[PDB]
Design a protein around this ligand. Structure first.
Ligand code: RS6
Ligand code: RS6
Ligand code: CL
Lengths: 305, 305
C-alpha cells in the first residue's frame, strides 16, 4: 500500500557524472564508455549567448581547451565533435562504471528521473514529466546544465534528457542525448516563452486507477461518456485530448479494476465540475498528472483492494 | 527555480543491498563491512508471526539456514546474533562498496530518503518524513521488508530506518538500524494501529519560505502573532506545537526572505482559518509538511554529495 512520486535508484547515473570546463564556464557532463556528453553552450561566453555561432566558436578550440574532471582525476580529451546541441568529448579512458545504456527520445506525458548535479557532483534525485508544451518543471539552479533525465526499466539505463536552460517562467528546457531540443526551443539567450501548458489526461486517468487499486472509490459515478463528449469537456479545463491510443494503453488497468476507460472518463468529468469537496485522492487535493499508465502498473499491486 | 520532493542520490546505499532468505521467507538486508542487517522476522513462518519467541526460533537456526545473495554471488554466513528487532548475520567477506556510515535514530518531523528494494534489488527512491505518530507514509509491497531510510551529511551515509511492516491504514512501521521501533509497534501479526497524526508545523513554515524564495507571495500579510497565540491556533487544527527551537532553526530563511518567523505564522494562521481560496502554493492545494528547514536551504543552495 501507499503511492509515492518515486524516482529510479540513481547509482548507475552517479558513476557517469563529470565536470566539464572550457574557460570560465563550468557545467556537468555524462561519461559513457570513452565519450563525455555535455551542452554545447559550454564554449560560449555570456557575450556570445544572444546569437552564438557554435561552428565558428568550436573550430577555435583544441582538445586541451576542455578540462574534464571525474572525481579528483583529470581526464585527457583526445577528440571533440558537435552533434546538434550536444558536444561530444572523446577521452583517453573508458568509464569503468559505464552501465548498460540506450539513448531514447521521449514524447510529452512521459516521466523520468532527474539526477540534479553541480560541478560534476550529484545533489538530488526527483521524478518529473515532459509537459505537453515540451518543458519540464524541474528544480535547477545555476551550474545544473548537463544534469540528466533517465529511466531504468530492468538493468538498462535509458537516457532521455539533458538540461540546457531555464525559461522566464521558471520552467526548464533541454535536449535528448543526440542534442535535439524538446519543443521549439534554441540554445540562445533570445526571448523565448513556453506555450500554454495543459494537463496530461491519460496520466490523470492512470492515477485515478491507482487510487481505485489502493482501495478508494468515492469519485466514481454511475455514468459513462463517449470519447468525443469527454474531449469537448476536457479541453474546457485545459486538459490534453484523450486519443484512442490512450484508451488502448489504459486497457490493462481497466481489466484489473473492473472499470471501463470511458466510465473512468465520466468520473474525471465529474471531478473537474465539482472539485474534491474537502476530500483527497492518494493524499492529494489536486488531480495528479505525472504518473503514466506504465508507472502505475510498476508501483501498484496486481491485486485491487 | 522550481521546488521538488527531492531524495538523496541512492548509489552509496544500492551497493549495500542484499537478499536474505530463511526457509520460505525472502527479504532485504543491508551489508556493511562483514555484517548483514535485516528484520528479525525473516526467521518466522506465518504461524510463528502470531506470537513469536525470537530467541527460541533463533536458537534452532544454524549459519547455513540463512542464504545471503549479493548480486549473483552467494555470501557465506559465519555467525548470527540478534539486537532488538534486527538480525545481524556475520559474513566471511567485508563489503568492498561499504561507504562511510553512521547509524542514527531520527525524531518525528525529520525527513529521509527510502530506497525501496525487492529480492535485494533496488526498485525506487523516494523522500518521506517520520510522522509525529511515528509511522511513515511509504510505498511498499510484499518483499519490501529490510528496505532502508537514510540521509547523507557531507560524504557520510546516516542510516535511520529499516522497514518491517504495514499497518491496516496502509501506513508503515519500522526500526532504527539498532532494531528499536519508531512508535508503539511490535513485530508480530496482531491488531496494531497508528495513533491520530498531526501536521509538522516547522516543516510547513519552511515550505512557505521555499514558496516565497520561488516567487509565490500571495499568502503574505502585514500581520504578526505571538508564539503563544499561534500555538493556541495550531493546536485547534491538529498541528504540532511550534517551539522557540523551531523559531531559531527558521532564522536563516527568515533573514533571506525578510519575513520574520512569527510574521509567517500569521500567514499560516490565516491559511488554516480561511483556506487557499482556489489558489495553490508551489503547485499544491494542501499545506506540505515533508520538507524540513534544512531541506529547503539545501535545495535552494545546491549542496552536493
Ligand atoms: C534565469 C536563466 C535564464 N539564467 C540566466 O540568467 C542565464 N542563462 C544561463 C543558462 C541557463 O539558463 N542556466 C540555468 C539552467 N537551469 C536553471 C537555472 C537557474 C538559474 F537561476 C540560473 C541559470 C539556470 C542559459 C543556457 C542557455 Cl542554452 C540559454 C540561455 C541561458 C541563460 O540565459
Ligand atoms: C499488512 C499485513 C496485513 N500483511 C500481511 O498479510 C502479513 N504481514 C507481513 C509483514 C508485513 O507487514 N509486510 C509488508 C510490509 N510492507 C508492505 C506490505 C504490503 C503488503 F501488501 C503486504 C505486506 C507488506 C509483517 C511484519 C511484521 Cl513485523 C508484523 C506483521 C506482518 C504482517 O502482518
Ligand atoms: Cl515516450
Amino acid at each position: 500500500s501507499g503511492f509515492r512520486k518515486m524516482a529510479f535508484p540513481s547509482g548507475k547515473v552517479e558513476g557517469c557524472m563529470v565536470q566539464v570546463t572550457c574557460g570560465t564556464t563550468t557545467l556537468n557532463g555524462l561519461w559513457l564508455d570513452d565519450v563525455v556528453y555535455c551542452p554545447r553552450h559550454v564554449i560560449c561566453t555570456s557575450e556570445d549567448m544572444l546569437n552564438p555561432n557554435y561552428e565558428d566558436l568550436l573550430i577555435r578550440k583544441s582538445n586541451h581547451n576542455f578540462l574534464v574532471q571525474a572525481g579528483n582525476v583529470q581526464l585527457r580529451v583526445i577528440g571533440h565533435s558537435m552533434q546538434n546541441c550536444v558536444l561530444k568529448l572523446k577521452v583517453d579512458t573508458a568509464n569503468p562504471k559505464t552501465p548498460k545504456y540506450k539513448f531514447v527520445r521521449i514524447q510529452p506525458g512521459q516521466t523520468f528521473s532527474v539526477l540534479a548535479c553541480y560541478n560534476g557532483s550529484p545533489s538530488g534525485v526527483y521524478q518529473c514529466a515532459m509537459r505537453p508544451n515540451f518543458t519540464i518543471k524541474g528544480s535547477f539552479l545555476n551550474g545544473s546544465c548537463g544534469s540528466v533525465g533517465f529511466n531504468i526499466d530492468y538493468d538498462c539505463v535509458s537516457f532521455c534528457y539533458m538540461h540546457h536552460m531555464e525559461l522566464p517562467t521558471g520552467v526548464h528546457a533541454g535536449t535528448d542525448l543526440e542534442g535535439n531540443f524538446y519543443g521549439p526551443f534554441v540554445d540562445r539567450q533570445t526571448a523565448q516563452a513556453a506555450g500554454t501548458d495543459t494537463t496530461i489526461t491519460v496520466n490523470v486517468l492512470a492515477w485515478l486507477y491507482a487510487a481505485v487499486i489502493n482501495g478508494d472509490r468515492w469519485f466514481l459515478n454511475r455514468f459513462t461518456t463517449t470519447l468525443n463528449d469527454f474531449n469537448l469537456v476536457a479541453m474546457k479545463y485545459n486538459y490534453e485530448p484523450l486519443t484512442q491510443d490512450h484508451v488502448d494503453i489504459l486497457g490493462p488497468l481497466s481489466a484489473q479494476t473492473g472499470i471501463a476507460v470511458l466510465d473512468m472518463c465520466a468520473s474525471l468529468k465529474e471531478l473537474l465540475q465539482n472539485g474534491m469537496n474537502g476530500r483527497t485522492i492518494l493524499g492529494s487535493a489536486l488531480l495528479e498528472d505525472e504518473f503514466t499508465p506504465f508507472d502505475v502498473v510498476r508501483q501498484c499491486s496486481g491485486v485491487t483492494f
